[PDB]
Design a protein around this ligand. Sequence first.
Ligand SMILES: *[C@@H]1O[C@H](CO)[C@@H](O[C@@H]2O[C@H](CO)[C@@H](O[C@@H]3O[C@H](CO)[C@@H](O)[C@H](O)[C@@H]3O)[C@H](O)[C@H]2NC(C)=O)[C@H](O)[C@H]1NC(C)=O
Ligand SMILES: *[C@@H]1O[C@H](CO)[C@@H](O[C@@H]2O[C@H](CO)[C@@H](O[C@@H]3O[C@H](CO)[C@@H](O)[C@H](O)[C@@H]3O)[C@H](O)[C@H]2NC(C)=O)[C@H](O)[C@H]1NC(C)=O
Ligand SMILES: *[C@@H]1O[C@H](CO)[C@@H](O[C@@H]2O[C@H](CO)[C@@H](O)[C@H](O)[C@H]2NC(C)=O)[C@H](O)[C@H]1NC(C)=O
Ligand SMILES: *[C@@H]1O[C@H](CO)[C@@H](O[C@@H]2O[C@H](CO)[C@@H](O)[C@H](O)[C@H]2NC(C)=O)[C@H](O)[C@H]1NC(C)=O
Ligand SMILES: *[C@@H]1O[C@H](CO)[C@@H](O[C@@H]2O[C@H](CO)[C@@H](O)[C@H](O)[C@H]2NC(C)=O)[C@H](O)[C@H]1NC(C)=O
Ligand SMILES: *[C@@H]1O[C@H](CO)[C@@H](O[C@@H]2O[C@H](CO)[C@@H](O)[C@H](O)[C@H]2NC(C)=O)[C@H](O)[C@H]1NC(C)=O
Ligand SMILES: *[C@@H]1O[C@H](CO)[C@@H](O[C@@H]2O[C@H](CO)[C@@H](O)[C@H](O)[C@H]2NC(C)=O)[C@H](O)[C@H]1NC(C)=O
Ligand SMILES: *[C@@H]1O[C@H](CO)[C@@H](O[C@@H]2O[C@H](CO)[C@@H](O)[C@H](O)[C@H]2NC(C)=O)[C@H](O)[C@H]1NC(C)=O
Ligand code: NAG
Ligand code: NAG
Ligand code: NAG
Ligand code: NAG
Ligand code: NAG
Ligand code: NAG
Ligand code: NAG
Ligand code: NAG
Ligand code: NAG
Ligand code: NAG
Ligand code: NAG
Lengths: 49, 50, 98, 98, 49, 148, 49, 49, 50, 49
Amino acid sequence: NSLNHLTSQLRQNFQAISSSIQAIYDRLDPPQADQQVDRLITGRLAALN
Amino acid sequence: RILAASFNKAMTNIVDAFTGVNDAITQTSQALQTVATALNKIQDVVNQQG
Amino acid sequence: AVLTYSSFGVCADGSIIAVQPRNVSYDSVSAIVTANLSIPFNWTTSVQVEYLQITSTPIVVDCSTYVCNGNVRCVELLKQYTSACKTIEDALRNSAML
Amino acid sequence: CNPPDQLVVYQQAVVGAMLSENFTSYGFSNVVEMPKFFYASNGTYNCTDAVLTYSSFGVCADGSIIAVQPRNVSYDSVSAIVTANLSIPFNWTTSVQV
Amino acid sequence: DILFSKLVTSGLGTVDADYKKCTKGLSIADLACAQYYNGIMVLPGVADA
Amino acid sequence: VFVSHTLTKYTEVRASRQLAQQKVNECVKSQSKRYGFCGNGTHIFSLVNAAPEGLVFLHTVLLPTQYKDVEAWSGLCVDGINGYVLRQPNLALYKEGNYYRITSRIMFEPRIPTIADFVQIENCNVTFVNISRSELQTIVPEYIDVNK
Amino acid sequence: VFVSHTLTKYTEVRASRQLAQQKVNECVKSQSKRYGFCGNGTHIFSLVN
Amino acid sequence: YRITSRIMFEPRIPTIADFVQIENCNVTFVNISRSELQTIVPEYIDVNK
Amino acid sequence: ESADVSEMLTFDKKAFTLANVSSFGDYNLSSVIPSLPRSGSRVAGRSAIE
Amino acid sequence: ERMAMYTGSLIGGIALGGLTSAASIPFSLAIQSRLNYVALQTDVLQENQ
Ligand SMILES: *[C@@H]1O[C@H](CO)[C@@H](O[C@@H]2O[C@H](CO)[C@@H](O[C@@H]3O[C@H](CO)[C@@H](O)[C@H](O)[C@@H]3O)[C@H](O)[C@H]2NC(C)=O)[C@H](O)[C@H]1NC(C)=O
Ligand SMILES: *[C@@H]1O[C@H](CO)[C@@H](O[C@@H]2O[C@H](CO)[C@@H](O[C@@H]3O[C@H](CO)[C@@H](O)[C@H](O)[C@@H]3O)[C@H](O)[C@H]2NC(C)=O)[C@H](O)[C@H]1NC(C)=O
Ligand SMILES: *[C@@H]1O[C@H](CO)[C@@H](O[C@@H]2O[C@H](CO)[C@@H](O)[C@H](O)[C@H]2NC(C)=O)[C@H](O)[C@H]1NC(C)=O
Ligand SMILES: *[C@@H]1O[C@H](CO)[C@@H](O[C@@H]2O[C@H](CO)[C@@H](O)[C@H](O)[C@H]2NC(C)=O)[C@H](O)[C@H]1NC(C)=O
Ligand SMILES: *[C@@H]1O[C@H](CO)[C@@H](O[C@@H]2O[C@H](CO)[C@@H](O)[C@H](O)[C@H]2NC(C)=O)[C@H](O)[C@H]1NC(C)=O
Ligand SMILES: *[C@@H]1O[C@H](CO)[C@@H](O[C@@H]2O[C@H](CO)[C@@H](O)[C@H](O)[C@H]2NC(C)=O)[C@H](O)[C@H]1NC(C)=O
Ligand SMILES: *[C@@H]1O[C@H](CO)[C@@H](O[C@@H]2O[C@H](CO)[C@@H](O)[C@H](O)[C@H]2NC(C)=O)[C@H](O)[C@H]1NC(C)=O
Ligand SMILES: *[C@@H]1O[C@H](CO)[C@@H](O[C@@H]2O[C@H](CO)[C@@H](O)[C@H](O)[C@H]2NC(C)=O)[C@H](O)[C@H]1NC(C)=O
Ligand SMILES: *[C@@H]1O[C@H](CO)[C@@H](O)[C@H](O)[C@H]1NC(C)=O
Ligand SMILES: *[C@@H]1O[C@H](CO)[C@@H](O)[C@H](O)[C@H]1NC(C)=O
Ligand SMILES: *[C@@H]1O[C@H](CO)[C@@H](O)[C@H](O)[C@H]1NC(C)=O
Ligand SMILES: *[C@@H]1O[C@H](CO)[C@@H](O)[C@H](O)[C@H]1NC(C)=O
Ligand SMILES: *[C@@H]1O[C@H](CO)[C@@H](O)[C@H](O)[C@H]1NC(C)=O
Ligand SMILES: *[C@@H]1O[C@H](CO)[C@@H](O)[C@H](O)[C@H]1NC(C)=O
Ligand SMILES: *[C@@H]1O[C@H](CO)[C@@H](O)[C@H](O)[C@H]1NC(C)=O
Ligand SMILES: *[C@@H]1O[C@H](CO)[C@@H](O)[C@H](O)[C@H]1NC(C)=O
Ligand SMILES: *[C@@H]1O[C@H](CO)[C@@H](O)[C@H](O)[C@H]1NC(C)=O
Ligand SMILES: *[C@@H]1O[C@H](CO)[C@@H](O)[C@H](O)[C@H]1NC(C)=O
Ligand SMILES: *[C@@H]1O[C@H](CO)[C@@H](O)[C@H](O)[C@H]1NC(C)=O
C-alpha cells in the first residue's frame, strides 16, 4: 500500500504541461521549461515526505 | 482496624479531589497529587477528539 | 508552585520560583550481618490513582461522498484515482476492526 | 438524496445492510429497527453465534444481527488461611494458546 | 459518573449520530448529522457502558 | 492528513491498552511484588473503574510509619564446630531481653526459634553467637540434647 | 508537517521513557530475577548515569 | 552426602528439616535403614528403637 | 512531557550523602559518582562518564 | 542539576543496608546480601568477593 501510493504519485501533472520531464524540455526553451519542471520537483518531494 | 480506618479516609479524599471541594489543599499529599495527574490526562483526552 | 515546567514554577500570586524534586526514602536491602537493624513496625494504607487510555472512537469516512458531495459527474472523474479512495478506506476500516 | 449505507460481507456474499430508512433495500426481505439505524438482512433471527462482530453488535451466518456478550471465564482466587472447607484443583488438562 | 460529567461533555466531540433521525428532516441537522452528510461516520464506542 | 492523525493516535492507545491489560492481570487479579508496578509501596490489592475512553486504577499500598530497632546476629556457632544460618535470607535473628526471636526483614513478625528455622553449614564466623549444646535451649526452647 | 514530526517522535520517547522507569524500579533499586531484563545473566546490581 | 543449590554451588550439611515426607518411594531413591540414616543426616538420632 | 518526567525525577538526601568513593571499598565507582561542586551554588556536577 | 541529584541518589542507595541510625555498611556486605537473594550462601569466609 505504501509503495503503490508513492509510485502512482509519479503520474500526477501537478498543474504542469505533462508529468514527463523529457516532454517539457522537448516543447519549451530552457527559460520556460525550468519554471514548469519546478512544479514537478516540489510535488514529487511532497510525495516522498 | 487501623488499616481499614486509613483506607476509608483515603477513599473519601479521592472523591473530594475528583469533585474539587479540597482543591486548595490537594498539594499536601502525593496521593492527592496522583489524582491531579489523572484528572489532567482525562481532561486532555476529553479536549482532543474533535 | 501551581504551574510548573522543568526547573521553573509559579505560585498563586505569580512569583516564579525554582522547583525541587520530591522527597522520597529509598527502600534498602537488609544486610545479613551482626549489627543493629531497623525494621518496619507500624503501617498506614495509601491509595494511589492511575489513568490509562484503552480505546479511541473509531471513525470511517466514505471517500466518494466527502470529495464529490454526491455530484454524479464528479464520481466519474474520481474513478481515475484508482488507488486514492481504496487506500484511505482500507486504512480506516482495518484499524477500526482491529 | 443518497446518503451512504454500509454492507456486511461474509464468505464472498452480502449478508446484510445498515440503512437510514425503513426500506427493504438491496433485495433483502426482512428489516428490523435498531437503537440508531435500521438493519436489513435475509435471515430468520434463530441464531446465537456471531461470525462478524463490532462493539456490542454481531451478525450470524444467515445475516441476523444479535447482541454479543462478554466471554464467560472463572477468575482465580487467593486461598484464604481459615478453618473451613476449601476447594483445590485435582485434575488438569493441557491447553495450547496461540 | 463523576469522571463522565464533571469533565467537559463531549457535545462538540466524537458522538455517534442517530442515522435514523438524520434522514427524516423533521428537524435541522445537528453537528452529528451534518458530518454524516459529508461521509464522516463516527462508529459506536467499543467500550459499551 | 486525517488518516495520518488517526493512525498515530492508534499507536498511543495500543501501547497504553497493553499496559492496562498487564495491570489488570498483575495488579487487580493477582498480587504483585514487582516494585513500582502497582504503586510505590507494598502492594495489597487494586480496584478498577470505567473512565472516559479508558480505565482508572485505585492502587492500595502499605507505607511504613514507624520502625523498630533490634540487635540482630548473623547466625549461631555451637561448640565451635557447628555453624548455622537462617533458612530464608529474608529472616533475621535478634535478641530481646534475655531470650531470642526471629522476625522477617520486611515486616516485624516475631517468631519463636525452632530447629527447622536453621540450615547447617560447614564452618563458622567470628560474628556468630558463641554457644554450647547444653545452653542451646536458651535460643531454641524446644531443643533437647538427646545424645548427651 | 512539523506537528506530525514532533508527535511521532513523542510516541517513541513516551514508550522508551516508560521502559526506563521500569528498569529504574526493577533493576536499579531492586534486584530482578526476570531473565533478560537487566542483562543476560544473574543480576546483582545496576547503575545509572 | 551433601545438599547444594542447583543455581549456585553452595554446599550444605543435610538436616532433617531439609526433607519433606511423601506417601510412597520411587525405585531411584537412595535405600537406607533407620539405623544407617545418620550417614546421610549427621544430626539424626533414632529416639525410638 | 514535562509532567511525567518530573514525576520520575525523585531525590533522597539520605542516600545522596553516600556518593563517596569510600562507600564502595574495592569497587571502583569513581567513573559514575557525581563531581564535587567547583564553586558552590549547586550540589553536584557531571560524572567522569556523563 | 536535577539529573546529578537523581543519579547520585540511586547510586548511593546501593550502599544502604537498613542499619539503625542510618549507618553505612561495608560494600562487601551489600554484595553478599544481593548474592543471598539468588541462593542461600554457605561460604562463611566469602573468598569469592
Ligand atoms: C512512597 O510515597 C510516599 C508518599 O509521598 C513517599 O514519601 C513519604 O511520605 C510521607 C507522608 O506520606 C512523608 O512523611 C512526612 O515526612 C516529613 C519528614 O520531615 C514529616 O515532617 C511529616 O510529619 C511526615 O512524617 C515521608 O517523609 C515521605 N518521605 C520523604 C523522604 O519525604 C515515600 O517516600 C515513597 N516511598 C518509596 C519507597 O518510594
Ligand atoms: C482460561 O481460558 C479457558 C478456556 O480456554 C477458560 O475455560 C473455560 O471456563 C469456563 C468457566 O469455568 C467454562 O465454562 C463452564 O463449563 C462447564 C462445563 O462445560 C459448564 O458446566 C459451566 O456452566 C460453564 O459453561 C468453560 O467450559 C471453560 N473452557 C475450557 C475450554 O476449559 C478459563 O476459564 C480461563 N481462565 C481464566 C482464569 O481466564
Ligand atoms: C545496638 O544498640 C544497642 C542499644 O540499643 C547497643 O547497646 C549499647 O552498647 C554499648 C557498647 O559499648 C554500651 O555502652 C551501651 O550501654 C549499650 N546500651 C544498652 C541500652 O544496652 C549495642 O552496642 C548495639 N549493638 C550493635 C551490634 O550494633
Ligand atoms: C465442611 O463440610 C463438611 C461436609 O463435607 C461439613 O460436615 C458436616 O457438618 C455438620 C455440622 O453440623 C454435620 O451435621 C454433618 O453431618 C457433617 N457432614 C459430614 C458428611 O460429616 C462441615 O460442617 C463443613 N465445615 C466447614 C468448617 O465449612
Ligand atoms: C564472616 O567473617 C568475616 C571475617 O572473617 C567478617 O568480616 C568482618 O566483619 C567486621 C564487622 O563488619 C569487620 O569489622 C571486619 O573488618 C571484617 N573482616 C574482614 C576480613 O572483612 C564477616 O562480617 C563475616 N560474615 C558474615 C556473613 O557473618
Ligand atoms: C566466638 O568464639 C570465637 C572463638 O572460638 C571468638 O573468636 C575469637 O575472638 C578473639 C577475640 O577477638 C580472637 O582473638 C580470636 O582469634 C578469635 N578466634 C577466631 C577463630 O575467630 C569470637 O569472638 C566469639 N564470637 C563472639 C560473637 O563473641
Ligand atoms: C531400593 O530397593 C528397591 C526394592 O524393591 C529396589 O527396587 C527393586 O529393584 C529390583 C532390582 O532391579 C527389582 O527387581 C524390583 O522389582 C524393584 N522393586 C521395586 C521397588 O519396583 C530399588 O532398585 C533399590 N534402589 C536402590 C538405588 O537401592
Ligand atoms: C579508581 O579508578 C580511578 C579511575 O580510573 C583511578 O584513578 C586513576 O588512577 C590512575 C592510576 O594510574 C591515574 O593514571 C589516573 O589519572 C586516575 N584518574 C583519575 C580520574 O583520578 C583510581 O586510582 C582508582 N582507585 C583505586 C583505589 O583503585
Ligand atoms: C526535599 O528535600 C530537601 C532537603 O534534602 C528539601 O529542601 C526540599 O524542600 C524537599 N522537598 C521538596 C518538595 O522540595
Ligand atoms: C500504629 O500507629 C497508629 C496511628 O498512630 C496507632 O494508633 C497504633 O496504636 C500504632 N500501633 C502500634 C503497634 O504501635
Ligand atoms: C417499519 O416498516 C414496517 C413494515 O412496513 C412496519 O411494520 C414498522 O412499524 C415500521 N417502523 C417504523 C419505525 O417506521
Ligand atoms: C435473499 O432472499 C430473497 C428472498 O426472495 C431472495 O429473493 C434474494 O435473492 C436473496 N438474496 C440473497 C442476498 O440471499
Ligand atoms: C431454531 O433452531 C432450532 C435449532 O436448530 C431448530 O430446531 C428450530 O426449528 C428453529 N426454529 C425455531 C422457531 O425454534
Ligand atoms: C455467559 O453467561 C451468561 C449469564 O450467565 C449466559 O446467559 C450466557 O449464555 C453465557 N455465555 C455467553 C457466550 O454469553
Ligand atoms: C482426571 O481426568 C481424566 C479425564 O480428563 C481421567 O482419565 C483421570 O482418571 C482423572 N484422574 C483422577 C485422578 O481423577
Ligand atoms: C522438660 O520439662 C520440664 C518441666 O516439666 C522443664 O523443667 C525442662 O526444662 C524441660 N526440658 C527441656 C529440655 O526444656
Ligand atoms: C553422640 O551420638 C552418637 C550417635 O550419633 C553416639 O554414638 C555417641 O556415643 C554420642 N556421644 C558422643 C560423646 O559422641
Ligand atoms: C516406636 O516404634 C514401635 C514399633 O517398633 C511402636 O510400638 C512405638 O509406639 C513407637 N514409639 C512411639 C513413641 O510411638
Ligand atoms: C566524600 O565524603 C567526604 C567526607 O569527609 C568528603 O570530604 C568528600 O568531599 C566526599 N566526596 C565528594 C566527591 O563529594
